[PDB]
Design a binder for this molecule. Structure first.
Ligand code: P5X
Ligand code: P5X
Lengths: 306, 305
């Protein structure tokens, strides 16, 4: 038993991290086969970032303007192209540690592990959720750009996030590995803001199921609700709508605990109306929404990765 | 900016994990050079566990009673010895992925990463503190025994924890890599209970300094405290005493922020009195005590490995 915010083991991703330098800008790149992926803003000075024309900035760069370092080993750049907000550096050396991998774009509410890096070297690993406002609450200092987020399924690393930006509120924004931003953000130093955020309802319900699995049941009640009546109440509390798909995804946790999804919805309904009355759930005085249904099942059933 | 509970990258440890089977019992082992380290209870059945005599159980074993699997490769056991509550299986093959490593015994309050494993395969990585009552608040299912806890300094893995047991409260107990239990716990299925736990005061203070470094000052006040008046108050909230050593360890964070350690102690005193009044500190509605002063500096300064 016990329930912790748990990252995927980072080894397969650690073997993919490199340092990318262009002029006075150094950040991280992801080295898969013979391509290094990094934020295209590696080609910018702080002055360029005010109003960059990435096409024009890049056309002035040659292969030898890009210094790629994999630990101690200099990789020679033999080609470069941009895809959306990611630069792709073709190198002379295929990464021999390249894992089985996919590039996947995730939905708001989905979690991933971040391997925070500086100078192509890992600092640490933590879990993030893609918020409904397409930000993440990360821990990123200057030089962290090009750090990635990922999930593992068996032996397949699904890369879902590359780090580009910190917003004024101290939350973080980035792209998928095809360089498409999550959220209405641009890679220019201009006035940009996290939108009003909402609570990831399906994840709170997953975490209530985690609480029940772990012996915390005080919030269960004799009541039920329709999906419709649940959503009418929860939307007043800036909770995301719960869909039939969310209900279906909670099926396995409902079956393991013997608590019908709509019965857990009735419990959550009462929690939103009454608060906790000074009690805690899994050692938290807040309703946690950064655990997916899969995160709970994976942790509570000991799923491993080969 | 931002501040998260952050584990060490697990790659160096992932390369050390194997599966150890003795009879019907399967758990995890740690393969460094030509030795596999695992809990000595791998030689027990559930029936053996009430009052096992491990000397007597072990002398009955041959090398070939121990099945060690490193992925697809069977490692041949060529010797075994017991050191306190750990079994050392000598194997015919040195682990080529052996990192630079040390075995360390940590103090209560110190943090480490756990790589939770089943069947010699990693499930996930999280950060833990050795509680003052010598338990850890982990996430461990049956089969997790032999999962290890560790710190990294650059390229050196310091192994500090091996997982043996879950207590009735759902907290966890284990040993150092020399097989000495943290706390008064024993590897027997006897009634054993976590003592009353306390809050790791020096860590709460570190985390308040993390909050200040991250741009949040709402909880500060105009007051100071003597160290003695601080301890008199905080002990009423089941906080560990703060020692002059703890004050000294908070020096660098105090100097970075311009907040005197005793001034931060005055803030903590008021937080315990008032609570948060609907606010959070670094996204938490409770006072977090599983970040050391070093964890804060490491994370706020971007130390890499
Ligand atoms: C000099 N360069 C290349 C440069 C590149 C990126 C940044 N910025 C600002 C912006 C990024 C985007 Cl995308 C639009 S505006 C950042 O947000 C980088 C950044 C990322 N993550 C934590 C940070 C923490 C502090 C300061 C900057 C951080 C500034 C300069
Ligand atoms: C059959 N075997 C070898 C065996 C070995 C250990 C255990 N126990 C009970 C005890 C361990 C110790 Cl040390 C003394 S009593 C555990 O606590 C293992 C364990 C560890 N971590 C999460 C657990 C969660 C559920 C159940 C058992 C868990 C039981 C059988």
């Amino acid at each position: 038993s016990g329930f912790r915010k748990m990252a995927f083991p980072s080894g397969k991703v650690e073997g993919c991290m490199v340092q990318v330098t262009c002029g006075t800008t150094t950040l991280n790149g992801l080295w898969l086969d013979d391509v290094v992926y990094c934020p295209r803003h590696v080609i910018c000075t702080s002055e360029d970032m005010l109003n960059p024309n990435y096409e024009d900035l890049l056309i002035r760069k040659s292969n030898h303007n890009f210094l790629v370092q994999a630990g101690n080993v200099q990789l020679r750049v033999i080609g470069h192209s941009m895809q959306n907000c990611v630069l792709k550096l073709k190198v002379d050396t295929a990464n021999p540690k390249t894992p089985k991998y996919k590039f996947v774009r995730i939905q708001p509410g989905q979690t991933f592990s971040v391997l925070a890096c500086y100078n192509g070297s890992p600092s640490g690993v933590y879990q993030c959720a893609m918020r409904p406002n397409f930000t993440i609450k990360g821990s990123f200092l200057n030089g962290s750009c090009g750090s990635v987020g990922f999930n593992i399924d068996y032996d397949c690393v699904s890369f879902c996030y590359m780090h580009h930006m910190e917003l004024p509120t101290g939350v973080h924004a980035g792209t998928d590995l095809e360089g498409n931003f999550y959220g209405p953000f641009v890679d220019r130093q201009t006035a940009q803001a996290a939108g009003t955020d909402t609570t990831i309802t399906v994840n709170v319900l997953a975490w209530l199921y985690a609480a029940v699995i772990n012996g915390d049941r005080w919030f269960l009640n004799r009541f039920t609700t329709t999906l419709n009546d649940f959503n009418l109440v929860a939307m007043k509390y800036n909770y995301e709508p719960l869909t039939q798909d969310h209900v279906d995804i909670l099926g396995p946790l409902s079956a393991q605990t013997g608590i019908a999804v709509l019965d857990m919805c009735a419990s959550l309904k009462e929690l939103l109306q009454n608060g906790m009355n000074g009690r805690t759930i899994l050692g938290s005085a807040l309703l946690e929404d950064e655990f997916t249904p899969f995160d709970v099942v994976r942790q509570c059933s000991g799923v491993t990765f080969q």
